[PDB]
Write a protein that holds these residues in place. Structure first.
Motif, PDB file in Angstrom:
ATOM      1  N   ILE A  31      -7.521  -2.350   1.114  1.00  0.00           N
ATOM      2  CA  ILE A  31      -7.186  -1.600   2.313  1.00  0.00           C
ATOM      3  C   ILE A  31      -8.511  -1.275   2.976  1.00  0.00           C
ATOM      4  O   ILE A  31      -9.466  -0.891   2.293  1.00  0.00           O
ATOM      5  CB  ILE A  31      -6.460  -0.275   1.975  1.00  0.00           C
ATOM      6  N   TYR A  42      -4.901  -4.247   5.518  1.00  0.00           N
ATOM      7  CA  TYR A  42      -4.071  -3.977   4.346  1.00  0.00           C
ATOM      8  C   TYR A  42      -3.591  -5.329   3.857  1.00  0.00           C
ATOM      9  O   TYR A  42      -2.966  -6.062   4.624  1.00  0.00           O
ATOM     10  CB  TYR A  42      -2.894  -3.081   4.752  1.00  0.00           C
ATOM     11  N   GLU A  46      -1.961  -5.665  -2.072  1.00  0.00           N
ATOM     12  CA  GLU A  46      -1.634  -4.249  -2.068  1.00  0.00           C
ATOM     13  C   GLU A  46      -0.155  -4.041  -1.807  1.00  0.00           C
ATOM     14  O   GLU A  46       0.497  -3.247  -2.488  1.00  0.00           O
ATOM     15  CB  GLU A  46      -2.496  -3.504  -1.058  1.00  0.00           C
ATOM     16  N   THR A  50       2.869  -1.826  -3.780  1.00  0.00           N
ATOM     17  CA  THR A  50       3.367  -0.587  -3.200  1.00  0.00           C
ATOM     18  C   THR A  50       4.659  -0.741  -2.417  1.00  0.00           C
ATOM     19  O   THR A  50       5.265   0.276  -2.044  1.00  0.00           O
ATOM     20  CB  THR A  50       2.320  -0.023  -2.244  1.00  0.00           C
ATOM     21  N   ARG A  52       4.801  -1.636   0.631  1.00  0.00           N
ATOM     22  CA  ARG A  52       4.533  -1.505   2.053  1.00  0.00           C
ATOM     23  C   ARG A  52       4.355  -2.881   2.670  1.00  0.00           C
ATOM     24  O   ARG A  52       3.773  -3.784   2.063  1.00  0.00           O
ATOM     25  CB  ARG A  52       3.257  -0.709   2.288  1.00  0.00           C
ATOM     26  N   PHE A  62      -3.516   6.560   6.110  1.00  0.00           N
ATOM     27  CA  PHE A  62      -3.279   6.424   4.691  1.00  0.00           C
ATOM     28  C   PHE A  62      -3.024   7.781   4.055  1.00  0.00           C
ATOM     29  CB  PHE A  62      -4.504   5.736   4.063  1.00  0.00           C
ATOM     30  N   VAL A  66       1.107   7.319   4.691  1.00  0.00           N
ATOM     31  CA  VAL A  66       1.511   6.271   3.763  1.00  0.00           C
ATOM     32  C   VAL A  66       1.421   6.726   2.313  1.00  0.00           C
ATOM     33  O   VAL A  66       2.288   6.402   1.497  1.00  0.00           O
ATOM     34  CB  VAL A  66       0.659   5.014   4.037  1.00  0.00           C
ATOM     35  N   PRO A  68       0.693  10.066   0.593  1.00  0.00           N
ATOM     36  CA  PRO A  68       0.439  11.510   0.428  1.00  0.00           C
ATOM     37  C   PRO A  68      -0.002  11.899  -0.971  1.00  0.00           C
ATOM     38  O   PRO A  68      -0.679  12.925  -1.124  1.00  0.00           O
ATOM     39  CB  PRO A  68       1.783  12.153   0.783  1.00  0.00           C
ATOM     40  N   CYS A  69       0.337  11.114  -1.998  1.00  0.00           N
ATOM     41  CA  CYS A  69      -0.109  11.476  -3.331  1.00  0.00           C
ATOM     42  C   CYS A  69      -1.623  11.426  -3.448  1.00  0.00           C
ATOM     43  O   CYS A  69      -2.168  12.016  -4.386  1.00  0.00           O
ATOM     44  CB  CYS A  69       0.582  10.624  -4.409  1.00  0.00           C
ATOM     45  N   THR A  70      -2.305  10.735  -2.525  1.00  0.00           N
ATOM     46  CA  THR A  70      -3.760  10.635  -2.508  1.00  0.00           C
ATOM     47  C   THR A  70      -4.414  11.724  -1.673  1.00  0.00           C
ATOM     48  O   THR A  70      -5.660  11.812  -1.629  1.00  0.00           O
ATOM     49  CB  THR A  70      -4.218   9.265  -1.982  1.00  0.00           C
ATOM     50  N   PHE A  96       0.014   6.079  -8.280  1.00  0.00           N
ATOM     51  CA  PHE A  96       0.664   5.985  -6.976  1.00  0.00           C
ATOM     52  C   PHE A  96       2.169   6.103  -7.168  1.00  0.00           C
ATOM     53  O   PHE A  96       2.758   5.345  -7.939  1.00  0.00           O
ATOM     54  CB  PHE A  96       0.365   4.636  -6.332  1.00  0.00           C
ATOM     55  N   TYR A  98       4.593   7.574  -4.316  1.00  0.00           N
ATOM     56  CA  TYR A  98       5.383   7.911  -3.141  1.00  0.00           C
ATOM     57  C   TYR A  98       6.075   6.651  -2.619  1.00  0.00           C
ATOM     58  O   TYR A  98       5.416   5.680  -2.231  1.00  0.00           O
ATOM     59  CB  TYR A  98       4.516   8.549  -2.057  1.00  0.00           C
ATOM     60  N   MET A 100       7.599   4.392  -4.121  1.00  0.00           N
ATOM     61  CA  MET A 100       7.362   3.273  -5.013  1.00  0.00           C
ATOM     62  C   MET A 100       7.540   3.819  -6.415  1.00  0.00           C
ATOM     63  O   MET A 100       7.461   5.030  -6.633  1.00  0.00           O
ATOM     64  CB  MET A 100       5.962   2.676  -4.830  1.00  0.00           C
TER      65      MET A 100
HETATM   66  C1  LIG Z   1       0.760   8.123  -3.280  1.00  0.00           C
HETATM   67  O1  LIG Z   1       1.527   8.672  -2.445  1.00  0.00           O
HETATM   68  C2  LIG Z   1       0.256   6.763  -3.096  1.00  0.00           C
HETATM   69  C3  LIG Z   1       0.859   5.928  -2.243  1.00  0.00           C
HETATM   70  C4  LIG Z   1       0.334   4.620  -1.853  1.00  0.00           C
HETATM   71  C5  LIG Z   1      -0.879   4.168  -2.325  1.00  0.00           C
HETATM   72  C6  LIG Z   1      -1.410   2.984  -1.865  1.00  0.00           C
HETATM   73  C7  LIG Z   1      -0.743   2.244  -0.912  1.00  0.00           C
HETATM   74  O2  LIG Z   1      -1.280   1.077  -0.505  1.00  0.00           O
HETATM   75  C8  LIG Z   1       0.471   2.691  -0.410  1.00  0.00           C
HETATM   76  C9  LIG Z   1       0.982   3.892  -0.864  1.00  0.00           C
END
Ligand SMILES: *C(=O)/C=C/c1ccc(O)cc1
Length: 125
Positions: A31, A42, A46, A50, A52, A62, A66, A68-70, A96, A98, A100
């Motif tokens: 990414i 992207y 990846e 995920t 996406r 991001f 996309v 939020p856990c990060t 990761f 969210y 997924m």
């Molecule tokens: C946590 O919410 C991670 C989500 C995530 C990580 C990486 C990506 O490429 C897409 C979503």
């Protein structure tokens, strides 16, 4: 497959030379973000992790939209610090989860050669 290893010391130089199809040939997720976290590139690997669509996430943020856990000191905080200092280059494990299935990964963030550009590289662990 593009002949590039995750975590290579000169990874930013190799990827600076690549187009989209080339980035999609990497063995790991890649990414490219601007300093605000908006998604510039992207790759296919990846999206395979995920779920996406690489063609549609471009332009989203991001950290806000996309992934939020990060949005945490452990991920976003390291990104912010490295963008500010001008020498982003950091590796850590993360999960990761969210939109997924929860997936353990190794993350490598590294400043890109082009201006206001920063790579986030991902592989499964
Ligand atoms: C946590 O919410 C991670 C989500 C995530 C990580 C990486 C990506 O490429 C897409 C979503």
């Amino acid at each position: 497959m593009e002949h590039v290893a995750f975590g290579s010391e000169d990874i930013e130089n190799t990827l600076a030379k690549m187009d989209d199809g080339q980035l999609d040939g990497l063995a790991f997720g890649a990414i490219q973000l601007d300093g605000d976290g908006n998604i510039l590139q992207y790759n296919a690997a990846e999206g395979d992790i995920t779920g996406r669509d690489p063609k549609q996430v471009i332009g989203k943020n991001f950290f806000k939209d996309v992934a939020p856990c990060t949005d945490s000191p452990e991920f976003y905080g390291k990104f912010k610090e490295g963008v500010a200092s001008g020498n982003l280059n950091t590796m850590f494990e993360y999960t990761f989860d969210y939109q997924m299935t929860p997936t353990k990964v190794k993350v490598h963030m590294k400043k890109a050669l082009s201006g206001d550009s920063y790579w986030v590289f991902v592989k499964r662990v």
